[model samples]
Target: DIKPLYCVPASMTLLFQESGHKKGSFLEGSEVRTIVINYAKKNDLVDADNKNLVRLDPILCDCILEKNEQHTVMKLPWDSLLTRCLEKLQPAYQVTLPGQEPIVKKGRICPIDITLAQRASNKKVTVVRNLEAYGLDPYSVAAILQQRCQASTTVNPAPGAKDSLQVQIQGNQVHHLGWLLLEEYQLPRKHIQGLEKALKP
Candidate 1:
Protein backbone atom coordinates (compact mmCIF):
# COMPACT_ATOMS: atom_id res chain seq x y z
CA ASP A 1 0.00 0.00 0.00
CA ILE A 2 1.22 3.50 -0.86
CA LYS A 3 1.57 6.11 1.89
CA PRO A 4 0.88 9.83 1.49
CA LEU A 5 3.42 11.83 -0.49
CA TYR A 6 3.64 15.63 -0.84
CA CYS A 7 2.81 17.21 -4.16
CA VAL A 8 4.52 20.52 -4.94
CA PRO A 9 2.19 23.53 -5.13
CA ALA A 10 1.47 25.83 -8.04
CA SER A 11 3.06 28.67 -6.02
CA MET A 12 6.54 27.21 -6.37
CA THR A 13 8.77 28.76 -9.04
CA LEU A 14 9.85 27.52 -12.48
CA LEU A 15 13.22 26.50 -11.06
CA PHE A 16 11.33 23.78 -9.22
CA GLN A 17 9.11 23.55 -12.27
CA GLU A 18 12.37 22.87 -14.07
CA SER A 19 12.30 19.50 -12.37
CA GLY A 20 10.01 18.51 -15.29
CA HIS A 21 8.17 16.17 -12.98
CA LYS A 22 4.60 15.50 -14.03
CA LYS A 23 1.68 16.93 -12.07
CA GLY A 24 1.19 13.47 -10.58
CA SER A 25 4.68 13.33 -9.08
CA PHE A 26 4.88 13.57 -5.31
CA LEU A 27 8.10 14.11 -3.38
CA GLU A 28 8.79 12.54 0.01
CA GLY A 29 10.46 14.07 3.13
CA SER A 30 13.85 15.78 2.58
CA GLU A 31 13.68 15.39 -1.20
CA VAL A 32 11.74 18.66 -1.37
CA ARG A 33 14.31 20.55 0.75
CA THR A 34 17.26 19.10 -1.09
CA ILE A 35 15.76 20.10 -4.43
CA VAL A 36 15.20 23.73 -3.32
CA ILE A 37 18.54 23.98 -1.51
CA ASN A 38 20.24 22.49 -4.54
CA TYR A 39 18.75 25.31 -6.61
CA ALA A 40 19.98 28.05 -4.21
CA LYS A 41 23.58 26.92 -4.37
CA LYS A 42 23.49 26.40 -8.15
CA ASN A 43 21.75 29.74 -8.86
CA ASP A 44 24.00 31.87 -6.57
CA LEU A 45 21.10 32.70 -4.21
CA VAL A 46 23.28 32.13 -1.15
CA ASP A 47 24.67 35.48 0.13
CA ALA A 48 28.44 35.73 0.54
CA ASP A 49 28.68 37.64 3.85
CA ASN A 50 26.06 35.49 5.57
CA LYS A 51 26.94 32.17 4.01
CA ASN A 52 24.45 30.67 6.43
CA LEU A 53 21.52 32.58 4.87
CA VAL A 54 19.83 32.65 1.47
CA ARG A 55 19.33 35.92 -0.38
CA LEU A 56 15.82 36.41 -1.71
CA ASP A 57 16.11 36.43 -5.46
CA PRO A 58 13.11 37.14 -7.68
CA ILE A 59 12.22 33.45 -8.07
CA LEU A 60 12.48 32.68 -4.37
CA CYS A 61 10.98 36.02 -3.35
CA ASP A 62 7.72 35.18 -5.09
CA CYS A 63 7.64 31.54 -4.03
CA ILE A 64 9.00 31.42 -0.45
CA LEU A 65 8.20 34.96 0.69
CA GLU A 66 4.92 35.55 2.52
CA LYS A 67 2.30 36.73 0.02
CA ASN A 68 1.93 40.32 1.37
CA GLU A 69 5.49 40.80 2.73
CA GLN A 70 7.31 40.01 -0.51
CA HIS A 71 9.30 43.15 -1.58
CA THR A 72 10.52 44.18 1.90
CA VAL A 73 12.00 40.78 2.85
CA MET A 74 15.50 40.65 1.31
CA LYS A 75 17.06 37.59 2.93
CA LEU A 76 16.10 34.82 5.36
CA PRO A 77 17.79 32.18 7.44
CA TRP A 78 17.51 28.67 5.99
CA ASP A 79 15.31 27.61 8.90
CA SER A 80 12.33 29.84 8.05
CA LEU A 81 12.99 29.62 4.33
CA LEU A 82 12.71 25.84 4.35
CA THR A 83 9.61 26.03 6.52
CA ARG A 84 7.97 28.30 3.95
CA CYS A 85 8.86 25.83 1.25
CA LEU A 86 7.09 23.07 3.19
CA GLU A 87 3.96 25.18 3.69
CA LYS A 88 3.43 25.55 -0.06
CA LEU A 89 3.28 21.84 -0.75
CA GLN A 90 -0.08 20.09 -0.89
CA PRO A 91 -0.79 17.27 1.59
CA ALA A 92 -2.14 14.55 -0.67
CA TYR A 93 -2.85 10.99 0.40
CA GLN A 94 -3.70 7.83 -1.49
CA VAL A 95 -5.56 5.22 0.55
CA THR A 96 -6.85 2.00 -1.08
CA LEU A 97 -8.66 -0.15 1.46
CA PRO A 98 -8.49 -3.85 0.63
CA GLY A 99 -10.90 -4.76 -2.21
CA GLN A 100 -12.10 -1.15 -2.38
CA GLU A 101 -11.68 1.60 -4.93
CA PRO A 102 -8.50 3.72 -4.64
CA ILE A 103 -8.93 7.33 -3.54
CA VAL A 104 -6.49 10.20 -3.98
CA LYS A 105 -7.54 12.93 -1.61
CA LYS A 106 -6.24 16.18 -0.24
CA GLY A 107 -6.90 17.62 3.22
CA ARG A 108 -7.52 16.30 6.76
CA ILE A 109 -6.09 12.78 6.47
CA CYS A 110 -7.06 10.84 9.61
CA PRO A 111 -4.82 9.51 12.38
CA ILE A 112 -5.16 6.58 14.75
CA ASP A 113 -7.85 7.37 17.36
CA ILE A 114 -7.87 4.89 20.25
CA THR A 115 -10.40 5.93 22.86
CA LEU A 116 -11.20 4.40 26.25
CA ALA A 117 -14.81 3.99 27.35
CA GLN A 118 -16.60 2.28 30.24
CA ARG A 119 -19.19 -0.42 29.59
CA ALA A 120 -21.39 -2.76 31.67
CA SER A 121 -20.46 -3.38 35.32
CA ASN A 122 -18.12 -0.36 35.19
CA LYS A 123 -15.76 -2.32 32.99
CA LYS A 124 -13.42 -0.37 30.72
CA VAL A 125 -12.71 -1.39 27.16
CA THR A 126 -10.63 0.32 24.49
CA VAL A 127 -11.93 0.95 20.99
CA VAL A 128 -9.42 1.84 18.33
CA ARG A 129 -10.32 3.19 14.92
CA ASN A 130 -8.55 4.42 11.77
CA LEU A 131 -5.59 2.05 11.80
CA GLU A 132 -6.21 1.65 8.08
CA ALA A 133 -4.92 5.16 7.57
CA TYR A 134 -1.46 3.91 8.55
CA GLY A 135 -1.88 0.73 6.50
CA LEU A 136 -2.26 -1.60 9.50
CA ASP A 137 -4.95 -4.27 9.56
CA PRO A 138 -7.45 -4.17 12.41
CA TYR A 139 -7.90 -7.95 12.35
CA SER A 140 -4.18 -8.57 12.95
CA VAL A 141 -4.09 -6.04 15.79
CA ALA A 142 -7.19 -7.64 17.30
CA ALA A 143 -5.65 -11.08 17.23
CA ILE A 144 -2.31 -9.88 18.62
CA LEU A 145 -3.89 -7.98 21.50
CA GLN A 146 -6.24 -10.84 22.25
CA GLN A 147 -3.25 -13.13 22.76
CA ARG A 148 -0.81 -10.66 24.32
CA CYS A 149 -3.17 -8.90 26.72
CA GLN A 150 -5.17 -12.06 27.46
CA ALA A 151 -8.35 -10.10 26.83
CA SER A 152 -11.36 -10.75 24.65
CA THR A 153 -11.14 -8.78 21.44
CA THR A 154 -13.49 -8.08 18.58
CA VAL A 155 -13.25 -6.35 15.16
CA ASN A 156 -16.13 -4.34 13.86
CA PRO A 157 -16.67 -2.02 10.89
CA ALA A 158 -15.85 1.61 11.66
CA PRO A 159 -18.70 4.10 11.52
CA GLY A 160 -17.70 6.28 8.56
CA ALA A 161 -15.89 3.70 6.49
CA LYS A 162 -17.33 0.94 4.34
CA ASP A 163 -14.37 -1.46 4.38
CA SER A 164 -12.28 -0.18 7.30
CA LEU A 165 -12.55 -1.87 10.72
CA GLN A 166 -12.13 -1.08 14.42
CA VAL A 167 -10.72 -3.26 17.22
CA GLN A 168 -12.27 -3.49 20.69
CA ILE A 169 -10.34 -5.04 23.55
CA GLN A 170 -11.27 -5.72 27.17
CA GLY A 171 -9.77 -3.35 29.80
CA ASN A 172 -7.80 -0.12 29.44
CA GLN A 173 -4.88 -0.99 27.22
CA VAL A 174 -4.24 2.29 25.45
CA HIS A 175 -0.64 2.25 26.62
CA HIS A 176 -0.10 -1.08 24.91
CA LEU A 177 -1.57 0.31 21.70
CA GLY A 178 0.49 3.48 22.18
CA TRP A 179 3.84 1.70 22.35
CA LEU A 180 2.89 -0.95 19.82
CA LEU A 181 2.09 1.71 17.26
CA LEU A 182 4.57 4.29 18.51
CA GLU A 183 7.79 2.29 19.07
CA GLU A 184 7.29 -1.16 17.53
CA TYR A 185 5.63 0.08 14.37
CA GLN A 186 7.64 3.35 14.31
CA LEU A 187 4.64 5.61 13.80
CA PRO A 188 5.15 9.25 14.73
CA ARG A 189 3.69 10.40 18.06
CA LYS A 190 1.76 13.18 16.31
CA HIS A 191 -0.22 10.60 14.33
CA ILE A 192 -1.65 8.76 17.36
CA GLN A 193 -4.38 10.43 19.40
CA GLY A 194 -5.82 9.86 22.91
CA LEU A 195 -2.54 8.70 24.42
CA GLU A 196 -3.03 11.05 27.37
CA LYS A 197 -5.85 8.76 28.56
CA ALA A 198 -3.32 5.97 28.98
CA LEU A 199 -1.38 7.50 31.88
CA LYS A 200 -0.97 5.19 34.89
CA PRO A 201 -3.45 5.76 37.70
Candidate 2:
Protein backbone atom coordinates (compact mmCIF):
# COMPACT_ATOMS: atom_id res chain seq x y z
CA ASP A 1 0.00 0.00 0.00
CA ILE A 2 1.13 3.59 -0.58
CA LYS A 3 -0.14 6.62 1.31
CA PRO A 4 -0.40 10.23 0.11
CA LEU A 5 -0.03 13.67 1.64
CA TYR A 6 -0.31 17.21 0.26
CA CYS A 7 1.76 20.31 0.94
CA VAL A 8 0.56 23.83 1.70
CA PRO A 9 2.50 26.87 2.73
CA ALA A 10 3.67 27.27 6.44
CA SER A 11 5.23 23.86 7.02
CA MET A 12 2.10 21.81 7.40
CA THR A 13 1.38 18.15 6.64
CA LEU A 14 -1.50 15.98 5.39
CA LEU A 15 -1.72 12.22 5.58
CA PHE A 16 -3.58 9.78 3.38
CA GLN A 17 -3.78 6.02 3.57
CA GLU A 18 -4.45 4.27 0.29
CA SER A 19 -3.56 1.08 -1.43
CA GLY A 20 -1.59 0.84 -4.66
CA HIS A 21 -4.59 -0.40 -6.60
CA LYS A 22 -6.58 2.71 -5.76
CA LYS A 23 -3.74 4.95 -6.80
CA GLY A 24 -3.42 3.01 -10.04
CA SER A 25 -7.08 3.57 -10.67
CA PHE A 26 -6.64 7.32 -10.21
CA LEU A 27 -3.53 7.70 -12.34
CA GLU A 28 -4.80 5.32 -14.96
CA GLY A 29 -6.66 8.07 -16.76
CA SER A 30 -4.04 10.79 -16.49
CA GLU A 31 -2.06 11.98 -19.50
CA VAL A 32 1.65 11.45 -18.94
CA ARG A 33 3.57 11.01 -15.72
CA THR A 34 6.65 9.29 -14.47
CA ILE A 35 5.80 6.07 -12.65
CA VAL A 36 8.71 6.44 -10.28
CA ILE A 37 11.28 9.03 -9.24
CA ASN A 38 14.36 9.01 -7.02
CA TYR A 39 17.57 10.92 -6.67
CA ALA A 40 19.56 11.04 -9.92
CA LYS A 41 17.47 8.22 -11.36
CA LYS A 42 13.85 7.60 -12.34
CA ASN A 43 11.49 4.96 -13.68
CA ASP A 44 9.54 6.87 -16.30
CA LEU A 45 6.62 5.54 -18.29
CA VAL A 46 3.38 6.61 -19.89
CA ASP A 47 0.19 5.46 -18.27
CA ALA A 48 -1.59 2.51 -19.85
CA ASP A 49 -3.88 4.87 -21.76
CA ASN A 50 -0.99 6.96 -23.02
CA LYS A 51 -1.32 9.35 -20.08
CA ASN A 52 1.86 9.61 -18.07
CA LEU A 53 2.38 7.16 -15.22
CA VAL A 54 3.61 8.03 -11.72
CA ARG A 55 4.39 4.92 -9.73
CA LEU A 56 4.21 5.26 -5.94
CA ASP A 57 6.32 2.49 -4.56
CA PRO A 58 7.48 3.57 -1.10
CA ILE A 59 11.12 3.00 -1.93
CA LEU A 60 11.30 5.06 -5.12
CA CYS A 61 8.37 7.46 -5.01
CA ASP A 62 9.28 9.02 -1.70
CA CYS A 63 8.67 12.61 -2.73
CA ILE A 64 5.14 12.19 -4.03
CA LEU A 65 3.28 12.70 -0.75
CA GLU A 66 3.46 15.96 1.17
CA LYS A 67 2.32 16.98 4.68
CA ASN A 68 -0.65 19.21 5.54
CA GLU A 69 -2.43 18.55 2.30
CA GLN A 70 -5.11 16.45 0.76
CA HIS A 71 -4.48 14.27 -2.25
CA THR A 72 -3.74 17.03 -4.73
CA VAL A 73 -1.61 15.60 -7.51
CA MET A 74 -1.72 18.73 -9.63
CA LYS A 75 0.37 20.31 -6.86
CA LEU A 76 3.19 17.96 -7.66
CA PRO A 77 5.30 17.92 -10.83
CA TRP A 78 2.94 15.79 -12.84
CA ASP A 79 -0.72 14.89 -12.56
CA SER A 80 0.15 12.30 -9.96
CA LEU A 81 -1.83 11.30 -6.88
CA LEU A 82 -3.87 14.04 -5.18
CA THR A 83 -3.85 15.89 -8.48
CA ARG A 84 -6.35 18.32 -7.05
CA CYS A 85 -3.94 19.67 -4.45
CA LEU A 86 -1.53 20.83 -7.14
CA GLU A 87 -4.32 22.80 -8.77
CA LYS A 88 -5.66 24.36 -5.59
CA LEU A 89 -2.27 25.56 -4.45
CA GLN A 90 -0.48 28.36 -6.23
CA PRO A 91 2.09 27.51 -8.85
CA ALA A 92 4.61 25.74 -6.69
CA TYR A 93 7.43 27.86 -5.41
CA GLN A 94 9.93 28.11 -8.22
CA VAL A 95 13.15 26.46 -7.14
CA THR A 96 16.07 26.79 -9.49
CA LEU A 97 19.07 24.51 -9.39
CA PRO A 98 22.19 26.19 -10.72
CA GLY A 99 20.88 27.15 -14.20
CA GLN A 100 17.52 25.49 -14.64
CA GLU A 101 14.23 27.35 -15.05
CA PRO A 102 12.16 27.45 -11.90
CA ILE A 103 10.90 23.98 -11.08
CA VAL A 104 7.79 23.11 -9.07
CA LYS A 105 8.92 22.03 -5.64
CA LYS A 106 7.16 19.63 -3.24
CA GLY A 107 8.08 18.02 0.08
CA ARG A 108 9.07 14.45 0.86
CA ILE A 109 6.98 11.68 2.48
CA CYS A 110 8.06 8.61 4.36
CA PRO A 111 7.28 5.86 6.83
CA ILE A 112 6.24 7.02 10.30
CA ASP A 113 8.95 7.92 12.76
CA ILE A 114 7.86 10.71 15.10
CA THR A 115 6.20 9.91 18.39
CA LEU A 116 3.77 12.22 20.18
CA ALA A 117 6.21 13.08 22.93
CA GLN A 118 8.83 14.04 20.41
CA ARG A 119 6.38 16.21 18.54
CA ALA A 120 5.19 17.88 21.72
CA SER A 121 8.81 18.50 22.59
CA ASN A 122 9.26 20.64 19.51
CA LYS A 123 9.16 24.33 20.41
CA LYS A 124 5.84 25.23 18.81
CA VAL A 125 5.74 28.16 21.23
CA THR A 126 8.82 29.42 19.48
CA VAL A 127 6.89 29.54 16.24
CA VAL A 128 4.07 31.51 17.80
CA ARG A 129 6.47 33.84 19.50
CA ASN A 130 8.57 34.42 16.40
CA LEU A 131 5.62 35.35 14.23
CA GLU A 132 4.05 37.43 16.98
CA ALA A 133 7.36 39.13 17.45
CA TYR A 134 7.29 39.93 13.74
CA GLY A 135 3.90 41.67 14.22
CA LEU A 136 1.55 38.96 12.97
CA ASP A 137 -1.28 38.20 15.39
CA PRO A 138 -1.97 34.87 17.06
CA TYR A 139 -4.98 34.38 14.81
CA SER A 140 -2.80 34.94 11.80
CA VAL A 141 -0.42 32.31 13.05
CA ALA A 142 -3.29 29.97 13.78
CA ALA A 143 -4.66 30.48 10.30
CA ILE A 144 -1.24 29.95 8.79
CA LEU A 145 -0.74 26.90 10.94
CA GLN A 146 -4.14 25.75 9.87
CA GLN A 147 -3.02 25.98 6.26
CA ARG A 148 0.52 24.75 6.73
CA CYS A 149 2.60 22.88 9.31
CA GLN A 150 0.38 19.87 9.02
CA ALA A 151 2.23 17.97 11.64
CA SER A 152 2.62 20.66 14.25
CA THR A 153 0.26 23.13 15.86
CA THR A 154 1.30 26.62 16.99
CA VAL A 155 -1.63 27.23 19.28
CA ASN A 156 -1.29 26.98 23.03
CA PRO A 157 -4.70 25.43 23.23
CA ALA A 158 -5.30 22.48 20.96
CA PRO A 159 -5.66 23.48 17.32
CA GLY A 160 -8.17 20.70 16.95
CA ALA A 161 -9.01 17.31 18.37
CA LYS A 162 -7.75 15.39 15.39
CA ASP A 163 -4.53 13.44 15.51
CA SER A 164 -3.38 15.49 12.51
CA LEU A 165 -2.49 18.37 14.82
CA GLN A 166 -0.51 16.30 17.27
CA VAL A 167 2.70 18.20 16.52
CA GLN A 168 4.86 15.45 15.07
CA ILE A 169 8.10 16.41 13.32
CA GLN A 170 9.14 13.56 11.15
CA GLY A 171 11.62 13.82 8.31
CA ASN A 172 8.90 14.31 5.72
CA GLN A 173 7.39 17.17 7.70
CA VAL A 174 10.75 18.86 7.88
CA HIS A 175 11.27 18.50 4.15
CA HIS A 176 7.79 19.91 3.63
CA LEU A 177 8.72 22.98 5.61
CA GLY A 178 11.45 23.55 3.11
CA TRP A 179 9.04 23.68 0.17
CA LEU A 180 6.63 25.93 2.06
CA LEU A 181 9.19 28.47 3.21
CA LEU A 182 10.49 28.49 -0.33
CA GLU A 183 7.11 29.70 -1.57
CA GLU A 184 5.61 31.69 1.31
CA TYR A 185 8.64 33.90 1.71
CA GLN A 186 9.56 33.97 -1.98
CA LEU A 187 12.82 33.00 -0.44
CA PRO A 188 15.86 34.46 -2.11
CA ARG A 189 19.09 32.53 -2.41
CA LYS A 190 19.97 33.42 1.14
CA HIS A 191 16.66 32.12 2.48
CA ILE A 192 17.07 29.04 0.36
CA GLN A 193 20.28 28.42 2.24
CA GLY A 194 18.31 28.56 5.46
CA LEU A 195 15.77 26.06 4.14
CA GLU A 196 18.50 23.64 3.25
CA LYS A 197 19.85 23.98 6.73
CA ALA A 198 16.40 23.64 8.29
CA LEU A 199 15.80 20.36 6.49
CA LYS A 200 18.60 18.55 8.18
CA PRO A 201 16.92 16.01 10.49
Candidate 3:
Protein backbone atom coordinates (compact mmCIF):
# COMPACT_ATOMS: atom_id res chain seq x y z
CA ASP A 1 0.00 0.00 0.00
CA ILE A 2 2.58 2.56 -1.04
CA LYS A 3 1.13 5.98 -1.64
CA PRO A 4 1.37 9.65 -0.71
CA LEU A 5 0.51 10.68 2.86
CA TYR A 6 -1.47 13.33 4.72
CA CYS A 7 -1.37 14.39 8.36
CA VAL A 8 -4.33 15.75 10.24
CA PRO A 9 -3.89 19.18 11.75
CA ALA A 10 -3.84 20.13 15.41
CA SER A 11 -6.58 22.60 14.62
CA MET A 12 -9.06 19.76 14.07
CA THR A 13 -11.21 18.68 16.97
CA LEU A 14 -11.45 15.27 18.75
CA LEU A 15 -14.48 14.48 16.67
CA PHE A 16 -11.82 13.27 14.22
CA GLN A 17 -9.05 12.52 16.72
CA GLU A 18 -11.05 10.19 18.92
CA SER A 19 -11.55 7.77 16.07
CA GLY A 20 -9.72 4.42 16.36
CA HIS A 21 -7.21 5.39 13.70
CA LYS A 22 -6.11 8.06 16.11
CA LYS A 23 -2.43 9.18 15.58
CA GLY A 24 -1.81 8.79 11.87
CA SER A 25 -0.36 10.26 8.73
CA PHE A 26 -2.40 8.16 6.39
CA LEU A 27 -2.78 7.35 2.72
CA GLU A 28 -5.19 9.42 0.58
CA GLY A 29 -7.63 6.76 -0.67
CA SER A 30 -8.42 4.92 2.50
CA GLU A 31 -7.62 6.09 5.99
CA VAL A 32 -8.50 9.76 5.70
CA ARG A 33 -11.49 8.95 3.53
CA THR A 34 -12.69 6.10 5.71
CA ILE A 35 -12.52 8.19 8.83
CA VAL A 36 -14.70 10.80 7.14
CA ILE A 37 -17.26 8.28 5.92
CA ASN A 38 -17.35 6.53 9.28
CA TYR A 39 -17.92 9.79 11.09
CA ALA A 40 -20.64 10.87 8.69
CA LYS A 41 -22.37 7.51 9.01
CA LYS A 42 -22.21 7.47 12.79
CA ASN A 43 -23.67 10.94 13.03
CA ASP A 44 -26.10 10.53 10.11
CA LEU A 45 -24.57 13.59 8.53
CA VAL A 46 -25.62 12.68 5.02
CA ASP A 47 -28.50 14.82 3.79
CA ALA A 48 -31.78 12.95 3.34
CA ASP A 49 -32.85 15.05 0.35
CA ASN A 50 -29.60 14.64 -1.55
CA LYS A 51 -27.87 11.31 -1.27
CA ASN A 52 -24.58 12.76 -2.53
CA LEU A 53 -24.56 15.77 -0.22
CA VAL A 54 -23.79 16.17 3.47
CA ARG A 55 -25.27 18.50 6.06
CA LEU A 56 -22.43 20.22 7.87
CA ASP A 57 -22.53 19.89 11.60
CA PRO A 58 -20.61 22.45 13.65
CA ILE A 59 -17.68 20.11 14.17
CA LEU A 60 -17.66 19.21 10.51
CA CYS A 61 -17.52 22.88 9.57
CA ASP A 62 -14.72 23.43 12.07
CA CYS A 63 -12.62 20.90 10.19
CA ILE A 64 -13.72 21.21 6.55
CA LEU A 65 -15.43 24.56 6.00
CA GLU A 66 -13.66 27.82 5.34
CA LYS A 67 -13.22 30.10 8.31
CA ASN A 68 -16.39 32.06 9.22
CA GLU A 69 -18.60 29.83 7.06
CA GLN A 70 -21.90 29.07 8.75
CA HIS A 71 -22.43 25.53 10.00
CA THR A 72 -25.93 25.83 8.54
CA VAL A 73 -24.63 25.61 4.96
CA MET A 74 -26.56 22.65 3.68
CA LYS A 75 -25.95 19.91 1.19
CA LEU A 76 -22.20 20.21 0.54
CA PRO A 77 -21.41 17.64 -2.08
CA TRP A 78 -19.54 14.83 -0.27
CA ASP A 79 -16.61 14.82 -2.65
CA SER A 80 -16.32 18.60 -2.54
CA LEU A 81 -16.31 18.50 1.23
CA LEU A 82 -13.67 15.78 1.17
CA THR A 83 -11.50 17.85 -1.15
CA ARG A 84 -11.67 20.85 1.12
CA CYS A 85 -10.95 18.73 4.16
CA LEU A 86 -7.96 17.16 2.46
CA GLU A 87 -6.69 20.59 1.47
CA LYS A 88 -6.82 21.65 5.10
CA LEU A 89 -4.64 18.71 6.15
CA GLN A 90 -0.88 18.75 5.72
CA PRO A 91 0.42 16.84 2.71
CA ALA A 92 3.45 14.62 3.17
CA TYR A 93 5.71 12.76 0.76
CA GLN A 94 8.05 9.80 0.91
CA VAL A 95 11.68 9.92 -0.17
CA THR A 96 14.12 7.08 -0.54
CA LEU A 97 17.71 7.11 -1.79
CA PRO A 98 19.95 4.20 -2.72
CA GLY A 99 21.46 2.40 0.32
CA GLN A 100 19.43 4.45 2.79
CA GLU A 101 16.22 4.15 4.77
CA PRO A 102 13.25 6.03 3.37
CA ILE A 103 12.06 9.21 5.04
CA VAL A 104 8.76 11.05 5.04
CA LYS A 105 8.40 14.80 5.13
CA LYS A 106 5.56 17.21 5.61
CA GLY A 107 4.59 19.78 2.95
CA ARG A 108 3.79 18.96 -0.66
CA ILE A 109 6.43 17.34 -2.81
CA CYS A 110 7.42 19.71 -5.59
CA PRO A 111 5.34 19.01 -8.66
CA ILE A 112 7.05 18.72 -12.03
CA ASP A 113 6.90 22.24 -13.52
CA ILE A 114 6.39 22.49 -17.28
CA THR A 115 6.44 26.10 -18.36
CA LEU A 116 6.62 28.03 -21.64
CA ALA A 117 9.01 30.91 -21.78
CA GLN A 118 10.39 33.45 -24.30
CA ARG A 119 14.12 33.10 -24.81
CA ALA A 120 16.87 34.57 -26.99
CA SER A 121 15.41 36.64 -29.90
CA ASN A 122 11.82 35.64 -28.92
CA LYS A 123 11.98 31.86 -29.18
CA LYS A 124 9.39 29.85 -27.26
CA VAL A 125 10.94 27.19 -25.10
CA THR A 126 9.55 24.68 -22.62
CA VAL A 127 11.27 24.48 -19.23
CA VAL A 128 10.81 21.42 -17.02
CA ARG A 129 12.15 21.02 -13.49
CA ASN A 130 11.57 19.60 -10.00
CA LEU A 131 11.60 16.06 -11.26
CA GLU A 132 13.95 14.35 -8.80
CA ALA A 133 11.21 13.46 -6.36
CA TYR A 134 9.26 12.06 -9.30
CA GLY A 135 12.16 9.64 -9.93
CA LEU A 136 13.33 11.05 -13.28
CA ASP A 137 16.82 11.93 -14.41
CA PRO A 138 17.37 15.28 -16.10
CA TYR A 139 20.14 14.14 -18.44
CA SER A 140 18.19 11.04 -19.51
CA VAL A 141 15.00 13.06 -20.00
CA ALA A 142 16.94 15.59 -22.06
CA ALA A 143 18.27 12.79 -24.26
CA ILE A 144 14.77 11.32 -24.64
CA LEU A 145 13.35 14.69 -25.69
CA GLN A 146 16.04 15.09 -28.31
CA GLN A 147 14.95 11.81 -29.91
CA ARG A 148 11.19 11.72 -29.32
CA CYS A 149 10.23 15.40 -29.16
CA GLN A 150 12.23 16.28 -32.33
CA ALA A 151 13.84 19.20 -30.57
CA SER A 152 17.16 20.31 -29.17
CA THR A 153 17.40 19.94 -25.39
CA THR A 154 19.69 21.14 -22.62
CA VAL A 155 20.10 20.42 -18.92
CA ASN A 156 21.28 23.26 -16.71
CA PRO A 157 21.68 23.97 -13.03
CA ALA A 158 19.25 26.77 -12.25
CA PRO A 159 20.53 30.05 -10.81
CA GLY A 160 21.14 29.80 -7.04
CA ALA A 161 20.36 26.06 -7.03
CA LYS A 162 23.52 24.25 -8.01
CA ASP A 163 22.42 20.70 -7.24
CA SER A 164 19.05 20.66 -8.99
CA LEU A 165 18.57 20.36 -12.75
CA GLN A 166 16.44 22.38 -15.17
CA VAL A 167 15.65 20.94 -18.62
CA GLN A 168 15.07 23.08 -21.65
CA ILE A 169 13.42 21.82 -24.82
CA GLN A 170 12.61 23.85 -27.89
CA GLY A 171 9.10 24.88 -29.14
CA ASN A 172 5.60 24.36 -27.72
CA GLN A 173 6.16 20.75 -26.79
CA VAL A 174 3.81 20.81 -23.82
CA HIS A 175 1.68 18.06 -25.31
CA HIS A 176 4.66 15.79 -25.80
CA LEU A 177 6.17 16.40 -22.38
CA GLY A 178 2.90 16.47 -20.51
CA TRP A 179 1.78 13.22 -22.12
CA LEU A 180 5.14 11.68 -21.41
CA LEU A 181 4.89 12.45 -17.72
CA LEU A 182 1.17 11.90 -17.33
CA GLU A 183 0.95 8.70 -19.37
CA GLU A 184 4.34 7.10 -20.07
CA TYR A 185 5.80 7.84 -16.66
CA GLN A 186 2.53 6.93 -14.86
CA LEU A 187 2.72 9.87 -12.53
CA PRO A 188 -0.31 11.32 -10.85
CA ARG A 189 -1.95 14.17 -12.80
CA LYS A 190 -2.11 16.41 -9.76
CA HIS A 191 1.68 16.34 -9.46
CA ILE A 192 2.20 18.01 -12.84
CA GLN A 193 1.84 21.66 -13.87
CA GLY A 194 1.23 23.61 -17.11
CA LEU A 195 -0.56 20.90 -19.10
CA GLU A 196 -3.17 23.44 -20.16
CA LYS A 197 -0.68 25.79 -21.80
CA ALA A 198 -0.62 23.89 -25.12
CA LEU A 199 -0.71 26.31 -28.01
CA LYS A 200 -3.79 26.03 -30.22
CA PRO A 201 -3.95 27.02 -33.88
**Estimated TM-score for each candidate:** 0.57, 0.23, 0.51
On residues 1-201, what C-alpha lDDT tens digit does candidate 1 reach at each position? 445667766667464766665454677648777887887888888889888898877788777665636346488788777877777777777765455666565644777898998878799999998886766778999988898778999998878744678999999898889767866666667777888899662
Expressed as tens digits, the lDDT of each residue in 67-186 for candidate 2 is 433353222333445354334322322234333344433333211212222335554322222222112245544556545655444444324342222222322344444444344533
In model 1, which residue pairs have backbone atoms overlapping below 3 Å? none
Cα lDDT, model 3, residue 185: 72
Q: What tens-digit string does per-residue lDDT give for candidate 3 at 120-192?
A: 7789999988766666788988998888889999999855543678899998788888767866776677778
Output the number of the TM-score-best candidate.
Answer: 1
**Superposition-based RMSD of candidate 2 using all C-alpha atoms, in angstroms:** 18.1
Against the reference, the lDDT scores of all candidates come to 0.76, 0.33, 0.74
Q: Output the lDDT of residue 43, model 1.
A: 85
Which parts of model 1 have CA positions greater than 4 angstroms off?
Answer: 1-7, 13-15, 20-29, 47-53, 68-73, 90-113, 143-165, 172-201
Q: How many backbone clashes does candidate 2 have?
A: 27
lDDT of 1 at 115: 97
Estimate candidate 3's RMSD in Å.
7.4
